Design a protein around this ligand. Sequence first.
Ligand code: NA
Ligand code: NA
Ligand code: NA
Lengths: 494, 494, 494, 494
Amino acid sequence: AVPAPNQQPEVFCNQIFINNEWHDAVSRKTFPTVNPSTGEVICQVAEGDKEDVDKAVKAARAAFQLGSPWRRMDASHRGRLLNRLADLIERDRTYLAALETLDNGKPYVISYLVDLDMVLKCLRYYAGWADKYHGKTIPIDGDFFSYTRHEPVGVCGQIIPWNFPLLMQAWKLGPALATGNVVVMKVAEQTPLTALYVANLIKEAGFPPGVVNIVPGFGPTAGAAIASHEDVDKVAFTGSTEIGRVIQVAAGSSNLKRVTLELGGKSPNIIMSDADMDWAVEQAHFALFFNQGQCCCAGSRTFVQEDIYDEFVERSVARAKSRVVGNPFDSKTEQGPQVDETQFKKILGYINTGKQEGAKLLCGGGIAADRGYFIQPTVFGDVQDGMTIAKEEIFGPVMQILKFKTIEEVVGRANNSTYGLAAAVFTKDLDKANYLSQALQAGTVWVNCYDVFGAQSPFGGYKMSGSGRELGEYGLQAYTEVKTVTVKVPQKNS
Amino acid sequence: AVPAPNQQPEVFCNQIFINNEWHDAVSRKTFPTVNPSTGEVICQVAEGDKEDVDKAVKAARAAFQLGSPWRRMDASHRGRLLNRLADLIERDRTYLAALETLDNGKPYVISYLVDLDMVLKCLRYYAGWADKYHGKTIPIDGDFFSYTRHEPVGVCGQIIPWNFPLLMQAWKLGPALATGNVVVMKVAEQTPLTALYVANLIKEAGFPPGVVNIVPGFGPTAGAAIASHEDVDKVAFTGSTEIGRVIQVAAGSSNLKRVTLELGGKSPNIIMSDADMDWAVEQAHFALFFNQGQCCCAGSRTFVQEDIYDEFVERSVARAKSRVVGNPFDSKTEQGPQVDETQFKKILGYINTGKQEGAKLLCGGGIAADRGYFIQPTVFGDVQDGMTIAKEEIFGPVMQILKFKTIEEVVGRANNSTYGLAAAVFTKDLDKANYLSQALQAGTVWVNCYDVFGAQSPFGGYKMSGSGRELGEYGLQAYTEVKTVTVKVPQKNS
Amino acid sequence: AVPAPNQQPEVFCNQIFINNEWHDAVSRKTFPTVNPSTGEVICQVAEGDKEDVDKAVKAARAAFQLGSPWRRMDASHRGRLLNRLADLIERDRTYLAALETLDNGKPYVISYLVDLDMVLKCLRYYAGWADKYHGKTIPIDGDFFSYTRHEPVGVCGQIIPWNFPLLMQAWKLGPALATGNVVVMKVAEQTPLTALYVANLIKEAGFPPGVVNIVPGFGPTAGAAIASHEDVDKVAFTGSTEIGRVIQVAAGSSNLKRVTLELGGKSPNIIMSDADMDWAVEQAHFALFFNQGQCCCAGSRTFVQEDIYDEFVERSVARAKSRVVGNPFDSKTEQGPQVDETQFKKILGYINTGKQEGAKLLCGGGIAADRGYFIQPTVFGDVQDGMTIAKEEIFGPVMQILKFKTIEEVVGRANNSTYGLAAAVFTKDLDKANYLSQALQAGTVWVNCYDVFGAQSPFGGYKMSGSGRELGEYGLQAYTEVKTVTVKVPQKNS
Amino acid sequence: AVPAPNQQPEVFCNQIFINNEWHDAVSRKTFPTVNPSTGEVICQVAEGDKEDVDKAVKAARAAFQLGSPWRRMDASHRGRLLNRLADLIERDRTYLAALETLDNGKPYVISYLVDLDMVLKCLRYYAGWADKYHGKTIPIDGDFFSYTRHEPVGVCGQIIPWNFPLLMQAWKLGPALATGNVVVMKVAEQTPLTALYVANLIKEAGFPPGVVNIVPGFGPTAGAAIASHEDVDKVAFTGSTEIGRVIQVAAGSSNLKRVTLELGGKSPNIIMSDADMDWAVEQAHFALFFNQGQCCCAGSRTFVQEDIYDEFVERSVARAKSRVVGNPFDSKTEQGPQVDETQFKKILGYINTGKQEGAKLLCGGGIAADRGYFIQPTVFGDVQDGMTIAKEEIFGPVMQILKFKTIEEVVGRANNSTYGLAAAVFTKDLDKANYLSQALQAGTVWVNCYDVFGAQSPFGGYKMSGSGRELGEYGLQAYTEVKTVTVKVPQKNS
Ligand code: NA
Ligand code: NA
Ligand code: NA
C-alpha cells in the first residue's frame, strides 16, 4: 500500500531553526530551491551564513551547560523523545515523502516505502541506545577504583548532503541525541525543505531549545563556518572526498575538533561465473541505478567473469532499456530527474568522457526529457581500469561493465582504487564468498545482495571514502568523550 | 618434530594437594591407577573422601578472605602467575606428555603436539583476560551513580573427567584463576597423575596456598562431597549426562551453589553431495576416532547424502582399516587403548548391540590385542535412527554411517536427539552452509571441519549436553558474581 | 498528579491464556482471589494444573518452531511489539493501578506512580535491547572464521510472586521477549488478575499466538509442573529460598533445564555516625516499610553506630508511629494490608517471637484494624544477631534496629548471613563508602539511598538469595543460548 | 631491589631500523644526542629524512600485504611475540634503565622502578588483547547474516616525545601490534637511543621484517614526512598542541589518514579544606615535580582552599626545598636535569615571567648547577588565573599555588582552560568527590591521588589537550578498521 501523494505539497518551514524558533538570516537573504522534475522554483529559503551559525553554536552551547534540562535529563528519557519524534514523522509520513520527492526528484513510491521507513527505523534504533552505552569499571593495579564515564562530545556540527535528505538527517541526529549531544546542522541547499519540517517535529516532540539547530545555506559560507568554529567540539560531514579534505584541514587549523567523514566511492560489484544470473543482473541494476545513481556506495564498477560476460551484458542492457524514466509522482516511474542542473551537466560530461575514451556505449547516453534534469539510463561495456569513467565517481545513471578472468585478478583490480566505501560479491560458493569478503578493502561487503542497510550494522569508508562509522553501536563512538576517574581506596580487593 | 619420550616416566606426586602441600588421605587409604596399554598398576594415589574435601574447602575459603594475598593481588599479576604456570608446563612438556600417555592411553605424539599445546594456549589465553573483564558504569534514571563490580564467585568445585586430563584441568583453572576465584578440584580416578604434577607447578609458579587444592578419589565420595558442600559457591562438572543430573540435584538440595555442566553428545556430521570427498572422508574419520573415540563431541552420527553414500562408505572403511592401533609410545600408532576395563567392556557391549539390531558391520568389531584395552576401529553402515548405536553415546572407536536424501530431512533427523553438543556440515554451497548452521540445535557447528577448538571460541551444550559455556570470553561468566553499587549524587548529568 | 481510582474495578480476564485465547482449566476447577483490605472474594480464577501447563508448553513450543512468525520476525520488530505493549499498559494505567491495589493491597497512589511507572520503564528499556545483543566474531587460531550466534534459550517457564505482580511480570517478559523466547508463566494465586489483563494486551499488541501463555493455579501443581516439564528449556523463579531449592532439584531431576532464582533476604542497612540523620531515618523507614514490608530486599537489619543510636531510634519510632495504615484507595494511606491471612498470621507470629526473645518493642506490635490483614508498623530495638527476628525474613512491617561500634565489626555482622540480596551504607565519608561497598557480600549495595531500581542496573542475590541477575544487559544472559560456528576458510588473514 | 647501574653505558644501536636491519640515512648525515646531566655528546645518530621515511613506509606496506607472515599470523601469536619482547626488555632492564637516564636525565632509580616496570606492564597488557578484540554478529532486519570484522587500520605513523622515551614507545607499539598493524615510528631527537635498542629486541623476539620500522631524525623533516605520506593510513602524535595542529592539517591535506593526538595540559589539582593534609602536600609535590616537571598531565595549577592555604603552602615550600637535585645516577637524587638546553632556557624564561607578573616567589627561582641543565625546585604563591604561569605549560619544576574559597568557584576556574588532559581532587567527602569528578572537563580525574597510570585505564585529552584515548581497551579503537559483511541467507530466524 502506498497512499496517494499530494503532488504540490505546501511548504511550512523555510527559515533558520535556533532555540526551537524560526529566524530569518541576519542579512535577510534568501535563496531559491528548485523542483528538479520541472526546473521551477518551489520557494525561497533563509540563506544562513557565518553570523547565523554563530547564533546557533551559542544556542547549542547554552543547551549543553551542566545543570541544563538536556544535561540533567535521564538517558532513558532521551530515548522517549527520539521515539516521540519517530511517531510524529510517521504521523506525517505521506506529506514528508511527497515533499522529499518535490525537492529532490526521487520517485514518491521510493520516498514513501524506502526513505521514510529507514528514517523511522534509524530513530527508533537509536532511541534504544540512549541508556545502554555503558562505561567500564576497570581492575587497575594498586589500591584504586577506576572507571570510565561515557560523556557527550558536546556541540556537534553536522553537514549533510542532498541525495537522501531525510535519511541523512536521521543518521546524524539519532546517535548524537541518543548520547546527549547538541547539534548545529547544515542541510543541503538543493534539498533543505524536509529537514526544516522535521525541526518543527523536534519542537513538537519536546526537545529542549538549542538541542537541535538547523541552518540552511551554502557550503563555503555556512558549512565552512561550522567546520572552522572555535566552539564546535566535533564535526561529522557527508559529501565529496574533495570537501572532506577541506573539513579535516579546517578542524586542524581551528580548535582540533574531532572529525568523521562519509565520502564517495567507486564501489566494485563482482559477479562470479557461478552466480544466480537472474538475481545478479537485477541486483547489479539496482546497485548502480538506485536513487538516480546518486548513492555514495553505488556499484559503479560491475566486474563480470568472462564466461558469463556476454549474457550478463545482454540482460543488463535489456533491463536498463526497460527502466522507466518520468514524473516521480507517477507510480510507474522507476527513475526521476537528477537533483539539479549542476549534476545534470556533470553527468552529461562523464557520458561524453566515456564515449571519447572508447568505452562501448550499449544504451542510453543522452537526455531523457525536455523539462527538468532527466538522463537516459546509460550502460558502457568493455570498460577498462585506466578509463576515467572506471575511476571517478559519476553519481548518475551510468553503468560500467568490466570483464575479468580469475578471482585473484579481480581482487587486485577491485582494490586498486583510492576509494573503499563498499563492494559486493555474487557467487554460490562458500569459499569464494569468504575469500573475497576478507580480501576486499571496503567498509561494507555485500554477498549476493547490494545496498542492504540496517540501522544495526555500521557503514563507512576505507581509504579516501571516509573515516569513522555510522549506524550500529559503532555510530555512538564518535559522539562520546571518555573520562577516566581513578579513586584511591583503603584496600583494593578482587 | 616430537622429542623422544621416556616410556616409563617416574611419578613424583600422588597425594592430596591442599595449601601447597601434599597430604595423605585422612583415612590413609589409597587406590591404584593403571596403565591401560598393559593393565598394570602405575602407582597408588591418595583416596580422598568427604573429610579431605572439607579440609580443601576450608583452605580455599581462607585463601579467599578479604585482605588475603590472593584477594589483594593485582588482576594483572594473576595473569603473570598464569603465564608463569604455562611456562613451567612448557618446560616439562615431554614429561607431562609421556605421563598423560602412560595413565590415559592416548598416543604420545598426540599428547605432545595436541593436548599439551592446547593446555599452553588455554592458560596463556586466560592469563590475558585477568585484567580485562570489566564491569559497567550505567546511566540509571535519577540523581545516582550506578556501576557494577565483577567479583569472583568464590570457592569453586571443579570435577573433571579422564578423556583429556590435562586439557580439562586447564579449561577449568584458566577462567577460574583469571577471575580471582579459588578452587577445589576432583580429578578422575583413571587419570589423576598429570593434574597432581601440575599442582606442583602451581606451587612453583607462586600461587598463594589454598588458591588451588586437588583431591583425587572417587565420584560417589569426593565428587559428591564437593557437589553437596555447604561452603562451595559454584560447581563445574564435565562428565556423563547421568551424573550431571546428580550434580544439579545436589546443588539444589544443599546451598543453591551455581552450576555449569559439560555433558555427552551424539553429534551429527552431515556430508552433503557437493562436499569435497577426500576431505570429508578424512575429517569424518577424525571426527569419530579422535582420542580413541573418547570425546564428548565425537561425530558419532555420520549422515551421508544418498548420491555419494556408497563411495563415502568405501573410502571410510578403507581409512578405518588402515588406522594403526598399538603401543601409544610408538610413533606409528594412531590409536591407543581405551581408558579402562569398564569402558572396554561397555564399548564391546555396544558393538554387540549394533550387530544384534541389524546395522551392517563393515570392519573391526572386536578386540585389537591380547593385552591392554585395545578395540579395533569399527564401522557400521546402514545405521537407522532408532538403533541403540544411533542414540546412545558409545565413547569408543565405533562409527555410524546413515544415509539421507534431502536437506530438510537431515535437519530433522540431526536435531531429533536429547543431546546437542556439536554438529558439522560438509558442503561447498554458501546457502546450504548457512541454512544448516542456523538450523542445527548444537552448541558448536563446524563447517568443512571438525573438532576445531580454539581458546577464543566458546564450547558447550544445548539440551541435555550441558549448560553454560567454556572457553572464550563466555567462559568467564560462570566465574563472576555481579555486584551493583548505586550511589546518591548531588545532581546527575550526562 | 494521580487520576482518581475506580475503587471497584471490573474484572475481564480470569481464565488460562494459551495461544491468545482464554481457556477454562481442563478440570473446570476455579479458585477464589481475595481483596486483602476486606477479606472478601473478588472473583474466581481458573485453577491450572499439570494438564493446563502441558497445553501451554505445546503452544509455546509450536510458536518457537523454526520458520514460525515469531522466529522469523525481525529483532527490531520484537522491539516494536514491546513498545506497543507498553503503550497499551499506559493507556490502561489508571485501571491497572486500581486492579493491582484491589487484589494486592498496596496503596493506589504507589501502584500508579511507582509500580505502573516501573512496568512501563522496564518494557521500554528491553524493547531497545531487542536488536542490540550482539554475538561475536572471534580471531581463532588457524585458517578459520569463527563467530557466535546469540539464539533464544527457547521455552521459558517463569514463576512470579505476589508482592509486585505487574512489575515482576515485566521483569520476566521484557528480557525473554526481547531475545525472542517464548513463555509459559505461572502467576501467584494471591494476585493473578493484573497479569491476566496484561495477557489481553499482549494479544492486542500483536504478539503471535503461543509466544506468551499464562497459567494461574497453585505452586505444588502448576509451578511444579513447569519446573519438572521435559520440554521447558529454562525456568526463572522468584519467591522463597525454600521453594528455590525445590525448583533447582526439579530441573536436575527432569531435563537439566537452565535455572535462575531471585529469592529472599535479610538485608543490612548500615548507618554510620557521620550520616545525614534526617535523610538516614527517612530512608531506613522506607527501606523496611516499603510495600507493607513485602520486599525481597527490605532493609530488615538496620545497623546503627553507637554514637547516634538513641537519636536515630527516637526519630525512627516517631516516624513509624505516624505512618498511616488504612484503605489503600485513600490518598492519605501509606500502608495497606498484608497480602493474605497466611502472611498476616506469620508476621504476628514473628512479632510474638521478637518479644519472647528479648528485643525491645518500641511501637506497634499488633493488629491495626478489625477487618482485612492490617498490621501496625512495628519497631524492635536492641536487637541482637542471634535473635530469630534478626535472622529470618519476616516480610511485613517489622523493623529491627541493632547497635554497633566499628566499621570492621559491622562488615562481619552484616555478612554473617546465608542471604545476600542487598545492603546499604549511609555515610558522608568517601573511604567508608568504598570500604563497605566492596566488603559487603550482596548483589546490590546502595549508598545514601535504598530501593533504587532502574531497568538499566542488574539486581539479584549472592549466597542463598538466588543466582543470576535480572534487569540491565545482564538480564539477557539467561535468555540466550550461545552457538559457535567455525568455518574452514582458504587462508585466514587479520 | 635496584641493581647497580653502569653510569656510562655503551651504545649499540644508532641507525635507522627498517626490515629488521640497520641503515645509515640516505644522506649519510648524523646528529648528536646529548647527556643533559653534563651537556656532552653521547654519540651520533642517523639523521632520517623524507627519503628514509619513504623506505620505511614501503617496508611496512610490504609486511602488511594480504598473505604475508604478519597478516597470516594467529592473533594469539601476536600476543606471544609481545610477551617475548617484554621478556627481552626485562632481561635487559638494568642496561635500558641506565641508558634511559643517560639520554633523558631522569633518576636511575625512577627509570628502573617506574619507567621500565610500566613498559613491561603495558606490553604484557596489550599482549593479552591480541586475540580478544572481537567484532560483532548483528541481528539486522531481513533475510541476511550481518557481521563485522575488526581489521588492522594498516600502516601506522607514530611520533613520540622525549619525556618518557621507552614508556611512550610501549604505549604506541602495544596496541598497534596487538591489533595486527605495522608501524613507522619517529623517535625524539633528544632521546632516540633506548627506542633503537628496543628495535634490536623486536628483531630478536621474532617480529617479521617491516612490522616495526624506526626513523630517528628531526620533526620538520622526518615527522612531517610521516604525517603527509600518501600511503600512511593512520598517525598518532604525542607532543605540543601547536604541532598537533600541523599533524591534523597534513592528514587532511594528504590522504585523509586517521589521526589521534595526545597534547599538552595545564592540569588543576584541587585541595579541598577537608583533605588529608600530609597526603595532599606530598601528592601535590609529586603531581607537579614528577619527571623534572616534564609530564603532559603535571598538576601545574594547585588550587588550595583558603582555610588551609597558609599551612599547605608552608609545608609545600619545605618539601620543595628538601627535594634533592643532582646526578641522576646517585641514589639520593630526586630530580635530574631538564632534557636539553632549549627547555632549560624556556623554563628559566617562565620563572622570570612569573616574578615579573607579580607571583610570589617562595623558593627556588634559578639554576641549580653550573653544568648540565639543572633547575632549582621553584614554588610561586598567590598565583592568579590571568598570569602567564597559570596559563601556559612550563614543563619544568615550577609549581603554581592558587587560593580559592568555594567548590563552585574552583570548578569554574579549573575548567576555564583550553586544555583538559587531567585534573585531581583531594577531599574526604563522598559528595564533593562525585560532584567534582563529574563536573571537571578533563580526560582523567584522580581522587586523592595523582599520576596513577594503569595500562588498563584509558588516558587522553578533552579540548585542545588531544583527541582519542590511549591505554585500556579504548587504545585499540584507533588501530581498528571496521568492515561490515552482510550476506543474503535463505531464511533468517532468531
Ligand atoms: Na530542490
Ligand atoms: Na590410568
Ligand atoms: Na639526550
